Design a protein around this ligand. Structure first.
Ligand SMILES: [Ca+2]
Ligand SMILES: [Mg+2]
Length: 223
């Protein structure tokens, strides 16, 4: 996250860190046994780390649980990143408490102008590399689809939306991939892609979760 702030320990209780010997993507806890992340974050051998703040220090509120199965969306296209969403089932049910909570799925989509909270342990520099150890947060509004499509001609589908600032300065970035975009208490997006980080007229692109609630509910109930 570039131009964001330190969230504070466990203030984003549904945020997860996917680890394969190191943190490589974020995710969101939707219930005690399931996590949703981005399909481009797919890897074999994932350990889900819940209740994290500093990912390099065991502070006492973590739960490290291995994944039993991963399900990438049936129509995921790695070339365009269309349908960039995946579900991860935990080998054991997580113990929910104040520090580990699940986030609700939306009942409807959100409007341009709605402010959301984006979080993650990704890069914090637009031109450079600096990976933080504690969780960073950023409040950003959903942008109109016209501004999104003019920034990326021929690349945005109905399953994506842009959020951020066209002036640049504030944005999610690599390392944040797969993490949550929560608006009005519902998970509306997943950090998916963009062009560099925090560049002028290159807002971040997010998977539009409201389009996948039926597939999510149907899939977790059958697995
Ligand atoms: Ca920790
Ligand atoms: Mg994240």
């Amino acid at each position: 996250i570039v131009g964001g702030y330190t969230c504070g320990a466990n203030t984003v209780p549904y945020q997860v860190s996917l680890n394969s010997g190191y943190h490589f993507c974020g995710g969101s806890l939707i219930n005690s046994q399931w996590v949703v992340s981005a399909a481009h974050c797919y890897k074999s051998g994932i350990q889900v780390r819940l209740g994290e703040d500093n990912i390099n220090v065991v502070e006492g509120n973590e739960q490290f649980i291995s994944a039993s199965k991963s399900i990438v969306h049936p129509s995921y296209n790695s070339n365009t990143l269309n349908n960039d969403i995946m579900l991860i089932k935990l080998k054991s049910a997580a113990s929910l408490n104040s520090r580990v909570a699940s986030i609700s799925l939306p009942t409807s989509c959100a409007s341009a102008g709605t402010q959301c909270l984006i979080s993650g342990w990704g890069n914090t520099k637009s031109s450079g590399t600096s990976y933080p150890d504690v969780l960073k947060c950023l409040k950003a509004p959903i942008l109109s689809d016209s501004s999104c499509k003019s920034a990326y001609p021929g690349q945005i589908t109905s399953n994506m939306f842009c959020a951020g600032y066209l002036e640049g300065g504030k944005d999610s970035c690599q390392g944040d991939s797969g993490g949550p975009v929560v608006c009005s208490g519902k998970l509306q997006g997943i950090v998916s892609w963009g062009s560099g980080c925090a560049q002028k007229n290159k807002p971040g692109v997010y998977t539009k979760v409201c389009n996948y609630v039926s597939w999510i509910k149907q899939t977790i109930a059958s697995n």
